[PDB]
Every structure is written in structure tokens, then in C-alpha cells.
């Protein structure tokens, strides 16, 4: 079934490989097993469940809001490609140094990173503007993925360097993502909205933190995980990172917009000090509309 | 000098290739010449000249302004890698379907696309905020590059489809980039500043428009251009796209900031209709500060 050379003969007591002169690329490295049938079976189940959640989130969003639908849109196109060509090039890149690189995974990331990070910069959905910090988040995160993809394509000390360059960009991303969530928390009304923001923060840092961990564990790192093993781990954090996070996002947005429908846009001036930061706290009381320096 | 297999024997009248069983990947496709010595020589000269311009722009910017320096920073790191490992994997990816993909080129693009597009969204350097349109520009442009990179890694009708998907995202980018330049033109003071904005628009559309043209002409498309031929074409549009555009950008920014130093921030309300758009026209006269509906 492969469309590289899979048939060869060993000659001179396995010191020579002879192949048909049919123009196909050849490498033993490419033919290594992707894992056990149990790992594969587990991966095909989690993918269908991902397809189901992607399908239901989309129809649900069908009843502003563009970031959640798009991540579900990209996720459904991803599943149709997995279904037909999951291990066909270039869903997997089989390269000259013998590496298998899951370009399918890194491509989806590059596609939706702006969408997710714009949504990070718009949790309430009320903003029409994005600050300087949003721009640093996008630049740092895209650098991270570009260095990481380069690390996956490389070997030896070149892989180590590009991974370290990704980690430096990544730390800058995590640091600034943390400030956004802190501002969001003190912006939204006091009740359920702050539960959802707290939920989104946990989902975000755990699921995003797991990507560099799965890199180090996978064939791109120390080869602890098999390819199916890596797919299974990716499906779990994929469900958290995309479907669940966007679902919680849409829910938060609904709650905020309903607050404007009942109480109206009643802002405050919570001056944080987690520094000398400032925030417009939506409240349910018209009376409350003053400067509350809550130095953290 | 290659670190894939370069030594082989033809057997049974060229129907069989025999290779040392040394674990190296092998493909004839990878060994095709990259072009003539004249093409190579031309490419090495334009690269040094690019290194020189990248070096001088950086020192010059050394005497806010972060987008121009970064593009020169990424450009210098690019040249040191070209100098030592231009045709080593993964600066070029040699893949199982026989393709050579210049990952070096696509990586630089992904890295700086936010930087350039943020700078597009900040020509005057006075804005502290970015509108909804900036976000669509970044999402569309990163999609374009992801589809294009996928097209370069693919073959046959799969390459055609991903290229078309890139073109659809690309058209959305070009359309919205055009509106930004139109707003910028009617925002800046009447004199030299509008010459520079006009210069930046021409540089941008010509240099950005040439990338899909060089794709179609290169090994990733109809193979009209050789690899050195493609490098030469890339160096020319690289000089325009990065160094020259950022230099004109820094110059514009200086002019605008000097306007605030002499006349001060005197805005207007030029209501454009190229629709029902609005603009804050910086003027050199305190008197002029009214609504000028200039329906285009
Ligand atoms: C064919 O090459 C193989 C290399 O595997 C040789 O087999 C082994 O021989 C050495 C003895 O020098 C042992 O260390 C290994 O234990 C042997 N077996 C294996 C499975 O590795 C074999 O001797 C060679 N034959 C000739 C004629 O050179
Ligand atoms: C070895 O294979 C080659 C294939 O190139 C054969 O060479 C050619 O033979 C055919 C005649 O059937 C001609 O059409 C070509 O013009 C020949 N030359 C070349 C350069 O292509 C050759 O006949 C084969 N030998 C044997 C014993 O099968
Ligand atoms: C801020 C977010 C917090 C979470 C961040 C997770 C921290 C992971 C860092 C590990 C350093 C260890 C070195 C990593 C080098 C990776 C490259 C590699 O695997 O090298 C290939 C090998 O040398 C040839 O087979
Ligand atoms: C909006 C910006 C204006 C400028 C935009 C430029 C327009 C280029 C479009 C061409 C369509 C022609 C089809 C292109 C298909 C490309 C894929 C390809 O080369 O296919 C490989 C081939 O089939 C196997 O060798
Ligand atoms: C968790 C993975 C999904 C659910 C388990 C299904 C599975 O793969 O189990 C096969 C079993 O281990 C037979 O070897
Ligand atoms: C998102 C990224 C997509 C990966 C691109 C997936 C493209 C897979 C192409 C499948 C292929 O190899 O096509 C062979 C052909 O269909 C049989 O003759
Ligand atoms: C050093 C780590 C790399 C940090 C990643 C680069 C940050 C992006 C950048 O240079 O942007 C600065 C901008 O001023 C942000 O608002
Ligand atoms: C910040 C200060 C400026 C230096 C920039 C980056 C260091 C990484 C240099 C890139 C080296 C890549 C070479 C390689 O990995 O081979
Ligand atoms: C334009 C390319 C840069 C300047 C020309 C240098 C060059 O490559 O010319 C070699 C000549 O054609 C010998 O065959
Ligand atoms: C920007 C993208 C960078 C491409 C990555 C370039 C990394 C090139 C690595 C060079 C290499 O193959 O290293 C072999 C080694 O130095 C000899 O034994
Ligand atoms: C269909 C072409 C694809 C267009 C590229 C996708 C546009 C990005 C998007 O979906 O964002 C919409 C957002 O509302 C923008 O402000
Ligand atoms: C907009 C409406 C929704 C459809 C989305 C994109 C069409 C492209 C589908 C992706 C097919 C890739 C398969 C391939 O190229 O193989
Ligand atoms: C599809 C959805 C998401 C959220 C994908 C996220 C991917 C990452 C956060 C990747 C992060 C990396 C880091 C932090 C450093 C090493 C290289 C990586 C790209 C794996
Ligand atoms: C390094 C600096 C720049 C400005 C790089 C730009 C690259 C592009 C504009 C690429 C555009 C593409 C398009 C429009 C459609 C086909 C795929 C491409 C990625 C080549």
C-alpha cells in the first residue's frame, strides 16, 4: 500500500540492498512499524469521538463567534484527511535523513493559532480592538511552531537547538497568555462567568503545556512513544485544546452578551497590581461604576 | 558531501540499483542538479548583497520600531544558515515522493508574516490598538502559507488543490491589505508621507504578488526554473519584500513622529466611500480639524 519502495533484496550477506529501478525513493527507516494494533484501535476510536464532537459543536454554533466555528471547521477537514490519507505523504513527511514528520499536526496548529490567540484576546466578545500584547502573543506562538517544526525535521544537536529556540518563544507566549487570563477574570461579572474563565485558563495551560511534553516523548524526541501512541496522546489534548475550549468560549460569550441584554454594559475601574494594570469590570449594579484599586 | 546515499551500482542492465547497507536514505530524484554555475554564482552575489543590506539596516535602526529590526534580525540568521547549510536537510527537505522543498524559505515567511502584517496594521506608528481587519489579515495569510507549503510537499492533483486553497486565502489577504493602504494614505499628512505610503503599497503588491508566480515557475510547480534560478528570483523579491519595505517603513514612522514634534497630533474626520469608511487625517494646521466626507 506505500508509494515509496517497499520491496527489496539483501545481497552479499546483507551488506547490499538491491531495488527495482522504477524511480521510487527508498529507506528502511520509513518502514518501521507505527505501533501495536491496540494503539492503532485506541487511536481510531478517539478520532471518531473527535469527529462526533467536531460535528456537534458546528451544528450547535449554527443556531462574532467566528473563532470557535473555524477551529471546528479545520478539525472536521482534518478528520476527512486522516480517514483517507493519515500516513500518506504529506500528512506524514518521510525525509532523506529517515525522519517521519506529522506535517498534518503542525499545519493544523499554524492554521488555528491566530484563531485561538485572537479568541484569547477576545474572551468576553465585547472588544472591537486588540492591544500591543495580542501582537506579541501571535508573533511568539508562530515562532514557537516554526522552530518546533524545524526541530522535528532535524536530528542530533540541530534538533536540540531549534527545540530550545521554540521553548524560549514558548515561555514568552505562556507568560503573556497568563496576564490576559488575569485581566479577563477581573473584567467579567462576579458569578458563573468567572467560573468559566477559570475553567478556560486550566484547559489552556494544561493542554498547551502537554504539546512540548508529547514532542520530547515522541519519535521527534527520545522515541519513548510509538506513532499510534503519539496519535492517542494528541487526540486527548486535541479534544481539550480545540473542541472543549471553544465550547466553553462560546458559553462564556453567551453569558456576557446576556448580561448586556439584562443589566447592560456597566463597567468599573479595577486597578490591578499583579505592576500597575487597569481593567473595566462588568457589574450587574448601575450604582457600582467607580475606581477599585485591587492591588494583587 | 551529501548525507543521503550518493554511491550506487546499476545491475541487470539498469533494472536494479544496489546500495551499501549503511542505513542511509536513497533516491535518484534528490541527486538532480540544482542548476548552472552561472545561476549559482548570481545567487551567491545577491545573498551577500542581501547580507550587507540586512547588516546596514540593523545598525541604522540601532540609533516602537520593533517590526523592522526583527525582519532584519531573521534575515541575518537566514544568511548565516544559507552560508553553512543552504542545501542541507532541513533547509531543504528531501522527501519520499522525491520532492525538494525549501523549508528555509517557508519557515522565514511564517516567522515574519505577523511582524510584516502587524507593521501593515501600524504604518504611522501612532496606533496602540488593532481593529478586527488586522486579525483577518493574519489568519488568511498564515492559511495561505500553510496551504502553499502543503502544495510544495505534495504532487499531482493534491498539489493543485492545496495551491487553489492558498490562492483563495491569498485573495482575501490582498483585498483587505488594499483597504489598509487606502486608509493609511488618507490618514498621514498631505506631503512626503503620502509619497512613502504610495511607495510602500507598490513594493508590497508587486513583491507579494511575485511569490505565487515563483511557486508556479519553480520545481514546486511546472519546473521551468532551476533551484539556483528560484533562489536568484527569491533574493530580488526578498530585498524588496523585507529590507527595502522596512526601510521605507522606518522612514515613514520618523516623518510621522517628527510631525507630532513640530505641529502636534491634529486629526480630522475624512469620511471615505471607496462603502462608508472613516479616517483621522493628521494635518499641519490647527484650524483644520473637521469632517471632510471625501466620497471615492
Ligand atoms: C555475514 O555477516 C554477519 C554479520 O551479522 C556475520 O554474522 C555474525 O558473525 C559474527 C562473527 O564475526 C558474530 O559476532 C555474530 O554473532 C554473527 N551473527 C549475527 C546474527 O550477527 C557472518 O559471519 C558473515 N558471514 C561472512 C561470510 O562474512
Ligand atoms: C537493456 O535495456 C535497454 C533499455 O534502454 C535496451 O536498450 C535499448 O533497446 C531498445 C530496443 O528494444 C531500443 O528501443 C533503445 O533505443 C535501446 N537503447 C537505449 C539507449 O534505450 C537493451 O536492448 C537491453 N538489453 C537486453 C539484453 O535486454
Ligand atoms: C514554559 C512551558 C513549560 C513546559 C515546557 C517543557 C520543558 C521541556 C524542556 C526540556 C529541556 C530538555 C532538552 C530538550 C531537547 C529536545 C530535542 C531532542 O529531543 O533532541 C533529539 C536527540 O538529541 C537526538 O535523538
Ligand atoms: C490575487 C493575487 C494575484 C496573483 C496570483 C497568481 C495566480 C496564479 C493562479 C493560477 C492558476 C493555475 C493553476 C495552479 C496550480 C498549481 C499547482 C501545480 O503547479 O501543480 C503541479 C502539477 O500538477 C504536477 O507537476
Ligand atoms: C484509551 C483508549 C481507547 C479505549 C480502549 C480501546 C483499546 O484500544 O483497547 C484495546 C485493548 O487494549 C486490546 O488490546
Ligand atoms: C492539513 C494538511 C493536510 C495534509 C495533506 C494531505 C494530502 C494527502 C494526499 C494523498 C495522496 O498521496 O494521494 C495519492 C492518490 O490519491 C492515490 O493515487
Ligand atoms: C527572546 C525570546 C523571543 C521572544 C519572541 C519575540 C517577541 C516578538 C517581538 O519581537 O515583538 C515585540 C513587540 O514589541 C511585542 O509587543
Ligand atoms: C537574540 C540575539 C540574536 C541571536 C538570535 C538567535 C540565536 C539562534 C541562532 C540561529 C542558529 C541556528 C543554527 C542551527 O541550529 O544549526
Ligand atoms: C543578475 C545576477 C547577478 C549579476 C551577474 C553575475 C552572474 O552570475 O553572471 C555570471 C555570467 O553570466 C557568467 O556565466
Ligand atoms: C530558518 C530555518 C532553518 C533551517 C534549519 C537548518 C539546519 C541545518 C543543519 C545542518 C546539518 O545537517 O548538520 C550536519 C552537521 O553539522 C554535520 O555533521
Ligand atoms: C473563503 C476564503 C478563506 C478566507 C480566509 C478565512 C478568513 C478568516 C476568518 O474566518 O475570520 C473571519 C473574521 O471575522 C475576520 O474578521
Ligand atoms: C468552505 C466550506 C467548507 C469546505 C472547506 C474546504 C474545502 C477543502 C477541503 C479539503 C480537502 C483536502 C483534500 C486533498 O487535497 O487531498
Ligand atoms: C490545534 C490546537 C493547538 C492548541 C495546538 C498547539 C500546539 C503547541 C502549543 C505547540 C507548542 C510547542 C512548544 C511550546 C515548544 C516546542 C515546539 C512545540 C511547537 C511542540
Ligand atoms: C519573507 C517575506 C515575505 C513577504 C514572504 C511572503 C510570502 C508569500 C506572500 C507567499 C504567498 C503564497 C501565495 C499568495 C499563494 C501560493 C502559496 C504562497 C505561500 C507561495
TrEMBL record, chains A, B:
It is found in: Membrane. The chain crosses the membrane at residues 45-63, 160-178. Disulfide bonds join 25-27. It comes from the Eukaryota. Belongs to the archaeal/bacterial/fungal opsin family. This is Archaeal-type opsin 1. The gene is acop1. The chain holds residues 49 to 245 of 712 of the full protein.
